[PDB]
Ligand binder design. Structure first.
Ligand SMILES: O=c1[nH]cnc2c1ncn2[C@@H]1O[C@H](COP(=O)(O)O)[C@@H](O)[C@H]1O
Ligand SMILES: O=c1[nH]cnc2c1ncn2[C@@H]1O[C@H](COP(=O)(O)O)[C@@H](O)[C@H]1O
Ligand SMILES: O=c1[nH]cnc2c1ncn2[C@@H]1O[C@H](COP(=O)(O)O)[C@@H](O)[C@H]1O
Ligand SMILES: O=c1[nH]cnc2c1ncn2[C@@H]1O[C@H](COP(=O)(O)O)[C@@H](O)[C@H]1O
Lengths: 189, 189, 189, 189
């Protein structure tokens, strides 16, 4: 019933989103890579900006994700800088560096995801945000998911997303933000 | 139930949105006169941007409106330039100059309104758009309403909005978009 | 010595810049088409934005031009909208329409040009502006030049730039801005 | 011969620029604290942007500075994020955090400054950039200067700017860049 192109370069993101989409959602890969200036202050701003740039060019309904790691004792770092921080380096160096940052510090943290729907024919835009609360692990563990998942432990668990990647589908920020986006969309039709 | 501020400096817009409020919504003018640079290409971009800027400086749900007159035979002019066009001059003078532009041309026009709700607490953003098709009168009539109302005739009528302003309450771009917004809030709150 | 690419999509601007160029400059068109959202509210802001965006992507010194027609009685219209106004129509039609807007108004106008140099290796940016004061003719005449030339009369002249386009080399907004820019660069080399 | 306002919120920048002002220039703080979203990817873009905004509000010549600390082994961190990083925390906390990140890494870094002049009357804008190269110390020393001074050691010295702040006047990113700017001006004017 509703068909959408995904506004995203990230293949792990393509992956997570199709696997939690209801049957009434068809989620297609964008026919083209489109440069987006990601100069927003928040996940919401960047998510909307990707949805709008992609929507205007493709002239078809689109969905966008903007996401990252928020560490409370580091002022929300890396936040929107999640990818850009030490971007020439491996996620493993990034995680080691942030471990050094956190010695002696409260390790509370969250992955946040802003999920955006834009229909450029109707000029309807919907954006919702959700999060998964956890903590940074004392050490990098496991090879599942992507990015910072090897050192993030969701609340109510003692393993990292790198160790129990299947759990992302159930409780991660992206799963909940998009299910909450699907839910709104479902209602308004 | 739901209090909301209006992300605008326009009294006329505040009046018009105030009068169509649903029973479950409280609608207040914003307590700050915040400057937003309206550099969007489209009414949606500007709407969305006022709502984010207002919602962030206020830390409370906001609604914003970006609106204008679009005259097809003039390329959609004045469009997002509706206020900035000859801004030091009265609307009378603006309407006069646009009448000259239109001599001998198809007179078909629309008012368009991009209506956006932003909740900065949850990060929920909803933006919708509507319009009233109509045409430019051959002369300026009435004093009702505001802006271009005195020379705009909605389809199915022969008086301008400046002549029959009460009719705005029922069929205007602003009345239609904001109801479209309420019907969305209602269904998802 | 100094080679610059021009951060422009306008081949008339290219040829006009080349013909006034000092002996020590080499001026080449951009080797790549790059998209820039011209969302500045002034010429200076758009000129600087084109220079920066093209400079950063080309990794090489560049120059940009933002230019337009400013008519005083019309609040400076079309201004930054010079190109966008009625952009699907010919200039003849955009002129006819502005002729209609000028009936019974003061006819004085200026072309304005913001000329920018950007060296992205040193991060040196230099932006200078000039103008040519004149007035709008009562009709369109000449096929020379480009854009609004055929109804623009320079102060101290009888003929429009469409009739005497050869005079642009000496006295246009573009000739004066760029030579001002060449002269600043002379001193700082 | 020239009264220029400083487009800045930083009392410490105010003082350090003031003290290297050349004879023909009366450098003042700005009368008004004005909101500027520093959303640029580089120092130059933020510098330019602060200059333009202030200069449009104030209608007089202004100068702006955007500056930060660039640590090479950390991908250029904190860079444009130099203030915003851990912004609710003291600079002692920030520097302590960054020492941890640097354990086992190349300590080299630069303070960088983009110094921009903007005349909103003529529409002339000049932006130049400079840097002071140096290294992060293994410890925080001295309460001189500001920000990251107490753990930055300019090349060829053994003291942090925290310990020798009076040498900034002569060798800092800021003095060099602002003198580079001054130099360029008193050729043209
Ligand atoms: O699910 C996640 N696991 C690990 N890292 C994530 C996840 N979601 C977003 N990120 C981080 O956020 C950045 C990409 O988000 P983007 O800016 O939305 O493309 C990368 O640093 C990711 O590693
Ligand atoms: O309901 C309408 N009637 C007449 N003019 C309107 C209406 N809505 C928007 N406008 C015009 O469009 C501009 C609205 O400014 P903005 O939405 O704040 O960018 C002003 O020129 C208004 O006069
Ligand atoms: O030298 C000129 N003669 C006539 N029109 C000009 C000249 N310079 C700029 N323009 C107009 O201003 C606009 C240039 O738009 P820009 O590409 O955004 O700088 C186009 O409308 C041009 O036709
Ligand atoms: O001379 C300096 N010494 C120490 N820190 C500096 C200096 N100049 C700039 N910074 C840092 O750079 C940031 C300035 O950011 P800005 O005010 O946004 O340009 C602040 O975090 C400063 O602490």
């Amino acid at each position: 019933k509703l068909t959408v192109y995904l506004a995203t370069t990230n293949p792990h993101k393509v992956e997570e989103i199709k696997m939690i989409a209801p049957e009434w959602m068809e989620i297609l890969p964008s026919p083209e890579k489109i440069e987006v200036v990601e100069d927003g202050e928040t996940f919401l701003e960047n998510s909307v900006k990707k949805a709008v740039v992609y929507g205007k060019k493709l002239k078809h309904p689109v969905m966008a994700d903007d996401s990252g790691l928020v560490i409370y004792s580091l002022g929300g770092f890396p936040g929107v800088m999640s990818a850009r921080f030490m971007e020439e380096h491996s996620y493993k160096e990034k995680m080691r560096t942030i471990l050094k940052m956190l010695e002696g510090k409260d390790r509370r943290a969250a992955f946040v995801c802003s999920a955006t729907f834009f229909d450029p024919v109707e000029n309807t835009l919907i954006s919702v945000e959700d999060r998964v609360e956890g903590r940074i692990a004392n050490e990098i563990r496991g090879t599942g998911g992507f990015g910072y998942d090897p050192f993030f432990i969701p609340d109510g668990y003692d393993k990292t997303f790198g160790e129990i990647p299947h759990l992302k589908e159930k409780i991660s920020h992206r799963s909940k933000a998009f299910r909450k986006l699907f839910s709104v969309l479902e209602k308004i039709l």
